[PDB]
Structure 1
């Protein structure tokens, strides 16, 4: 007997002896849940590490050309004491208008000599065609003058020429948390 092997009246049964047959391991069923917008995951930063983010408005891009923009930080972390601060894993993603002309991509590498050449070498690349319009520079830039980054632009290409402020781009960046966040200021100056 085995599965629902419960009937009525007699009914013998025999099998055969050999070297088994079925697969060695057995099955497990599953059910991929359908996820909606934003349900994703915004992994928390790490130890004593802050994640400073902010965006930069786009520049009128052309046909199939690709522009660049030395990225600069905000006044807060723009302190010589914080400039020489260390960074962690970091990502870039981009918010853009709904009515978009063609599909396009974007990345970031050391102040490239050749602007288009960037895409031939960057670790990750925010692609529009992809479901995830963003790139993860995990350990890619871990450790670096929180100023170093300045000399190092970001690259963006477009299939169809396009306007400026036509799209922003955020940069969630891991970096050691400063000390300002806490304590006030010396009353005695």
Structure 2
């Protein structure tokens, strides 16, 4: 005999529960500037490590969630899709095998790849690619990609480089 009536708050952008990561982990933050693409063409673009993460310690840690949210040039126009995937030698087909995929057309331009990699070594993402694809041609450096990732906190980025003492 329930009939509880709810009100629904419109939600201001940026409002949100934010989701901080499970303990012992530390989300890092870094970028990957886009290249200009031919219209409807789908270029691959490789995933370099951040400077600090190229260190030979951390290349074998353990990675959990991956969150690729795609920013844009504000006045870019067309539909745009992007996703992480295995190093395929070809085109779209990474999308047809991708676990998840971002879209410009739907409110949240983001994708979260939980379970996709937990828990790989951090260094092995070098084998991976992101993929980018757009309905329309776009100018270069206009689709920056903020993929984000966490790992067990670099336990021994604790101290100064010893030299000297």
Deviation sequence 1:31-51 (CA, Å, 0-9, x none): 111111111342101211111
Task: Kindly report the root-mean-square deviation, in angstroms, between the aligned alpha carbons of the 2 structures.
Answer: 1.5
Distance in 2 between residues matched to 1:41 and 1:124, nearest whole Å: 22
Distance 1:187 1:55, change over 3 A: closer
Q: Matched residue pairs, number?
A: 165
Name the CA distance, whole Å, in 1 between partners of 2:109 and 2:29: 16
How many angstroms does 1:174 deviate by? 1.6
In 2, Cα distance between equivalents of 1:148 and 1:98: 33
1:85 and 1:146 in contact (8 A); partners too: yes
Q: RCO greater where, 1 or 2, for CA within 8 Å and sep 6 or more? A: 2
Write out aligned runs for 1:1-80 (5 A).
25-80=1-56
Question: How far did residue 145 of structure 1 move?
Answer: 1.5
| Structure 2 residue ranges without an equivalent (≥5) | none
Higher helix proportion, which one? 2
> Is 174-183 or 58-67 further displaced after alignment?
174-183
Larger radius of gyration: 1
- CA–CA distance in structure 1, aligned partners of residues 119 and 9 of structure 2: 37
Give the drift of 1:181. Answer: 4.3
The Cα shift of 1:183 comes to: 2.8
**1:1-189, aligned counterparts within 5 Å?**
25-186=1-162, 188=164
Assess, with a 3 A threshold, how the Cα gap between structure 1 residues 84 and 77 changes in structure 2: closer, same or farther.
same
- TM-score of the aligned structures, taking structure 2 as reference length: 0.93
Q: CA deviation at 1:188?
A: 4.6
Q: Could you list the runs of 4 or more consecutive aligned residues of structure 1 that deviate by over 3 angstroms after TM superposition?
A: none
TM-score by length of 1: 0.82
Residue by residue over 1:82-125, the C-alpha shift from the partner in whole angstroms, topping out at 9 and shown as x without a partner, is 10111001110111112113111110111122231111121211
